[PDB]
Amino acid sequence: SLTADQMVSALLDAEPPILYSEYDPTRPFSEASMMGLLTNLADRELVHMINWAKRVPGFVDLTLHDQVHLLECAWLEILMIGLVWRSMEHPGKLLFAPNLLLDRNQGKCVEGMVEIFDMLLATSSRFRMMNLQGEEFVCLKSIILLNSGVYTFLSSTLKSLEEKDHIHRVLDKITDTLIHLMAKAGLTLQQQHQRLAQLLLILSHIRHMSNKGMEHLYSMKCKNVVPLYDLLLEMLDAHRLHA
Amino acid sequence: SLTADQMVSALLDAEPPILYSEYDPTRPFSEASMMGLLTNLADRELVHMINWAKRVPGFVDLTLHDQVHLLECAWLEILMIGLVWRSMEHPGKLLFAPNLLLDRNQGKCVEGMVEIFDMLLATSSRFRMMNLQGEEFVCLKSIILLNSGVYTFLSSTLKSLEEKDHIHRVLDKITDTLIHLMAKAGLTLQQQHQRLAQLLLILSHIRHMSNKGMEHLYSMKCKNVVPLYDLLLEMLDAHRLHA
Numbered sequence A, B: 001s002l003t004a005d006q007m008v009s010a011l012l013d014a015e016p017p018i019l020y021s022e023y024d025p026t027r028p029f030s031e032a033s034m035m036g037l038l039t040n041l042a043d044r045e046l047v048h049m050i051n052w053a054k055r056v057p058g059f060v061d062l063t064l065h066d067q068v069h070l071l072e073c074a075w076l077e078i079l080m081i082g083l084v085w086r087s088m089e090h091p092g093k094l095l096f097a098p099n100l101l102l103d104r105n106q107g108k109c110v111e112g113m114v115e116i117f118d119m120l121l122a123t124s125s126r127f128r129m130m131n132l133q134g135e136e137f138v139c140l141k142s143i144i145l146l147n148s149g150v151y152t153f154l155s156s157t158l159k160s161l162e163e164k165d166h167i168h169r170v171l172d173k174i175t176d177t178l179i180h181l182m183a184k185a186g187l188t189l190q191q192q193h194q195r196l197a198q199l200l201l202i203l204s205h206i207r208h209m210s211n212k213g214m215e216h217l218y219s220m221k222c223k224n225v226v227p228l229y230d231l232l233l234e235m236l237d238a239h240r241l242h243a
Ligand SMILES: C[C@H](CCc1ccc(O)cc1)NC(=O)Cc1c(-c2ccccc2)[nH]c2cc(OCCN3CCCCC3)ccc12
Pocket: A035, A038, A039, A040, A041, A042, A043, A045, A046, A075, A076, A079, A080, A082, A083, A096, A110, A111, A112, A113, A116, A117, A209, A210, A212, A213, A214, A216, A217, A220, A222, A223, A224, A228
């Protein structure tokens, strides 16, 4: 009982900010660790992602455990679609941050990184070619959050089935919202279903990139101590005291 | 210039056969290597997948190199959606072959395997819940073949761009075909776009499962000698002599 334009406005209002890379811009770059740069940016974006996630319509009606599970599952996909989105207008570069716009050569210092840079760049080029709009982008990122882990709840409890039912209902509303957007934009019925499919097929590519990067993650340094699940739980298990 | 019902019939006619597991059914099962069973079945299904792939409308108009690249990319996803499809009517089991229907316990002998069994079972349950039809299934498997590697062509040649253009056009026709199917089935316009989205979001899960299994593949025994690319090329680089 949210309309389409309500859902769009809600998602647009919940958008997280664009963070800066923390390096000293007054000192030489070759001293910079790209894995430290990425690790430190990603850790800071994560805190803002939890706050975004709570403002996605339907998300907080889920159990805490299910909220954690969706985010644990989708966090890198969600970082990556935000990255490809802000890179759209910067052909051949990735806009990690407004003070950190890298080309593929700047990924070659880390084993396996340039392959993921090449995939991200390719995905950003496809959004450019499709002329992805800001309204469509926030619907897609919401879908990733709700869809990516919904099939790995290891649960068949009644509660679990009620949760899955609700998620599938929210996802159906976002679908309606995407379609509303395109119709408003002047697309034919046929063009509408064609573009919905083009947009959702990109999500398979974003999953692919996430998996490939997670692979290099749980070897390569970073943050691995204190399981991600309980960190999410602490961030998610909020009190109501700062009301 | 293929209609929707033409495309459905074509895809239905191109379907590969259902293969049997080769073990001696007269000898004890604990002697059986599940990784050998899977390896040997998957290797035999691969040969039939190449022949299916050539009968997917639009596929053979691609360059040989691009055909190889799509299959190298999508072969495990394509095996997995066929598996979840034939398992649909066998709750709690995976129908690897008509003489090889396994439950999750039968995957616990291999490190990491039961997790992938659990994901496949969950995906087959979702197809059951949606009542996936045979016509929809062959469209989805065709989409996986054409979509999964189209963004990792490392190419911007004119030829490459023409290829990408054609693939995106074939994918748009299959989209039209899915929609045709549902309209025929009596779904409302709204239900049609909702179900198209539900179906394509499952493809993100199938990608996930493929990636996770490939991870355990390129450590675990199997077939790894003589790069998959050249094997695909030999199977794909056919003569016309048996005309
Ligand atoms: C090139 C991509 C860029 C990922 C990325 C980061 C931030 C963005 O806003 C968008 C996209 N990296 C990966 O796909 C995987 C990866 C690598 C990597 C890739 C190739 C070779 C070697 C290393 N290091 C990290 C560090 C990290 O952040 C720190 C880990 N924290 C993050 C928050 C969640 C808990 C773990 C998150 C992802 C990655």
